[PDB]
């Protein structure tokens, strides 16, 4: 809280350190007047300063310093409604006073914005390299992000009342629009052109907007939007996988390999090396022409050529809870399936990884990665559901898993080798239950071997460590 004094001196010192081409004796005259009366007004606009003095005049509602060469703002008077600071080569911005209506920083250098009052009914940060925003206030009817490097659009609410609302968000880097867009009136309107989003999300936008009977927002966009395929964004085997190019099933099943990157490569890892792995995994990863039960399934068959070689031979002990973990996942890809069906903008693998990482804490899938349209209840639901089936059918699916199927096959055989002889009932029994109920109305070849594998894990391998 300077004192008129202060003020003057201030502004003088910061005159005489005018870098020429720039007019610092008039900004101090417009200083100066404005503090000499009540002026809620400054403008230093146009006059090319590479710098403002620390101490703007408290009292101002509105200041303008449009098109100078500013890097930084001083702290901004409290009371100030609007601040129009557009073309210079700001960094960031000050914290914004509480009462502000308006802000207008468009064609700056920003990175980041700091937090939007509640007042903020209008915005410009066009053409900066803005990353991701701050939550934005009910207040904002206007929005323009035009040329930022935003990755996500903003999830709208409808205001109580309907009020015209315009957002630009145009040429962007959002790819991937929030189901909550469809909430929205038809009074407001989304400019999304120029990003890139999936052409799933664009065949959506186009399907639900060229109904009639749609009476959401005006959404505007454009649908404009082999071997050496592998290797790329996880370098140097783009020519060591070519040796294996030449091979059966590499069409379909390596062109569709559309944290989480970082180990992609740690399972791409081992598929390098051994051809055991990749001889298998374009097994069934190639004929499912859903993509996390297959993701599911390289995971299983990658597991399986561990106990192959016999990880899991004293230590079925983590062999067992990590089954555990394992069925609680294709739990929750079940759940990702069910929710899909009325999400418009996303797909299962999407939905799934958000239920894993979301849930990891949870239900701990340390095989999880730490960090969409999910809500908090179908968090908890999915949590309900995963621990009851969990209780009612982990013993029996675990008896027919894969990965301790092969521990068996090679550590412990007798009782391995006397399910397989008790096949007995796979001629005994299995011709009568064939369709003993499919015209009273293979599904009882899967329930047959349940009931011996399951009684093989009666009389289980791991009660020998324990």
Avoid at 66 to 76: A, C, F, G, I, R
Avoid at 317 to 337: Q, V
Avoid at 431 to 460: G, H, N, S
Wanted: net charge negative; hydrophobic share 40%; glycine share 2%.
């Amino acid at each position: 809280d300077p004192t008129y004094a202060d003020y003057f001196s201030a502004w003088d010192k910061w005159e005489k350190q005018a870098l020429p081409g720039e007019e610092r004796d008039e900004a101090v005259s417009r200083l100066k007047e404005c503090l000499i009366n009540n002026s809620d007004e400054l403008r230093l606009d146009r006059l090319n300063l590479s710098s403002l003095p620390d101490n703007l005049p408290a009292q101002i509602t509105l200041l303008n310093v449009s098109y100078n060469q500013l890097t930084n703002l001083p702290e901004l008077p409290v009371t100030l409604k609007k601040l129009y600071s557009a073309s210079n080569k700001l960094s960031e911005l000050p914290v914004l006073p509480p009462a502000l209506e308006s802000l207008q920083v468009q064609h700056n250098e920003l990175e980041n914005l700091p937090a939007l009052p509640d007042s903020l009914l209008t915005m410009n940060i066009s053409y900066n390299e803005i990353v991701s925003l701050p939550s934005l206030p009910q207040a904002l009817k206007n929005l323009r992000a035009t040329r930022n490097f935003l990755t996500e659009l903003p999830a709208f609410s409808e205001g109580n009342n309907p009020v015209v609302r315009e957002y630009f968000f145009d040429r962007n880097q959002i790819s991937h629009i929030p189901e909550s867009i469809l909430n929205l009136r038809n009074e407001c309107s989304i400019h999304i052109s120029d990003n890139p989003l999936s052409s799933h999300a664009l065949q959506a936008l186009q399907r639900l907007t060229s109904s009639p009977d749609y009476h959401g927002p005006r959404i505007y966009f454009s649908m404009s939007d082999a071997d050496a395929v592998t290797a790329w964004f996880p370098v140097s085997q783009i020519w060591h996988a070519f040796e294996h190019e030449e091979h059966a099933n590499t069409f379909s099943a390596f062109l569709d390999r559309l944290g989480f990157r970082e180990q992609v490569a740690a399972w791409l890892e081992k598929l390098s090396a051994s051809a055991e792995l990749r001889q298998q995994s374009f097994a069934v990863a190639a004929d499912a022409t859903r993509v996390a039960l297959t993701w599911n399934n390289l995971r299983k068959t990658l597991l399986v050529h561990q106990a192959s070689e016999g990880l899991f031979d004293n230590d079925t002990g983590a062999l067992l809870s990590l089954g555990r973990e394992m069925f609680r996942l294709e739990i929750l890809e079940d759940i990702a399936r069910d929710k899909v069906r009325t999400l418009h903008f996303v797909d299962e693998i999407e939905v799934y990884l958000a239920f894993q990482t979301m849930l990891a804490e949870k239900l701990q899938l340390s095989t999880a990665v730490k960090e969409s349209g999910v809500t908090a209840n179908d968090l908890r639901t999915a949590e309900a559901m995963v621990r009851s089936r969990e209780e009612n059918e982990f013993t029996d699916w675990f008896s027919l898993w894969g990965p301790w199927h092969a521990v068996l096959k090679r550590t412990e055989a007798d009782r391995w080798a006397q399910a397989e002889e008790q096949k007995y009932e796979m001629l005994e029994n299995e011709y009568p239950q064939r369709v003993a109920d499919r015209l009273k109305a293979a599904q009882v070849m899967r329930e047959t071997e349940q009931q011996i594998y399951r009684q093989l894990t009666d009389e289980v391998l791991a009660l020998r460590l324990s």
